[PDB]
Scaffold this active site. Sequence first.
Site, PDB file in Angstrom:
ATOM      1  N   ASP A   1      -6.595   2.000  -1.166  1.00 50.45           N
ATOM      2  CA  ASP A   1      -5.743   3.046  -0.623  1.00 50.45           C
ATOM      3  C   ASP A   1      -4.596   2.477   0.216  1.00 50.45           C
ATOM      4  OD1 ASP A   1      -4.663   5.295   0.565  1.00 50.45           O
ATOM      5  OD2 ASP A   1      -6.620   6.069   1.219  1.00 50.45           O
ATOM      6  N   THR A   2      -3.426   2.334  -0.401  1.00 51.73           N
ATOM      7  CA  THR A   2      -2.277   1.735   0.270  1.00 51.73           C
ATOM      8  C   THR A   2      -1.728   2.603   1.397  1.00 51.73           C
ATOM      9  OG1 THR A   2      -0.749   2.551  -1.436  1.00 51.73           O
ATOM     10  CG2 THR A   2      -1.580   0.290  -1.668  1.00 51.73           C
ATOM     11  N   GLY A   3      -2.064   3.895   1.351  1.00 48.21           N
ATOM     12  CA  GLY A   3      -1.685   4.860   2.372  1.00 48.21           C
ATOM     13  C   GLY A   3      -2.588   4.875   3.593  1.00 48.21           C
TER      14      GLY A   3
END
Lengths: 99, 99
Positions: A25-27
């Site tokens: 999850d880059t967010g």
Amino acid sequence: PQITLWKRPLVTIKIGGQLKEALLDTGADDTVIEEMNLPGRWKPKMIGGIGGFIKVRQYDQIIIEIAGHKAIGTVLVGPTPVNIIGRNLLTQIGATLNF
Amino acid sequence: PQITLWKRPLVTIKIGGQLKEALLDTGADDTVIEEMNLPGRWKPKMIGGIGGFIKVRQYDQIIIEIAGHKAIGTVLVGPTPVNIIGRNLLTQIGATLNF
Ligand SMILES: O=C(O)c1ccc2cc[nH]c2c1
């Protein structure tokens, strides 16, 4: 590996000697793992989550293996609906976005 | 480009002829854009954001530029504090997670 985004980027992780699956999850700034027993010391924390705020146990310097790639860093343990590998650990394994 | 994750992966976007910045977010299925005028018909949804719930308007077939890459797809418009580019648009620009 190269992971396309046509479905959720789920991978196998190893944490506390247990194999789980987790979303890359880059967010997410942080890593949030489901309620489990972890070898190591923890300190109490609260984080924003799906639909509100949750109490978590913060474990620093946890050994975690992400799709065969070793990381050591902070893991937050609490009632997350999905195991989340955030940037704090994605940077350790050298993950990048490419397009 | 090849984007490292030591900071939040923010890029400039263009939507409704307006220039904004947005978080490339592999943990999001959908794209969520802050309150703005989109010239179209919409349908109301609810999404569970970090810290609570918000009401959004679903717009289909929205033309969007993300870091120079043209994409078309569904956008959810509402009171979000961060613009979120989710997988529905990341797939359109050929984004992958690599390590
Ligand atoms: O693990 C616990 O018992 C506990 C209790 C209180 C708090 C507050 C933040 N994290 C907590 C964990």
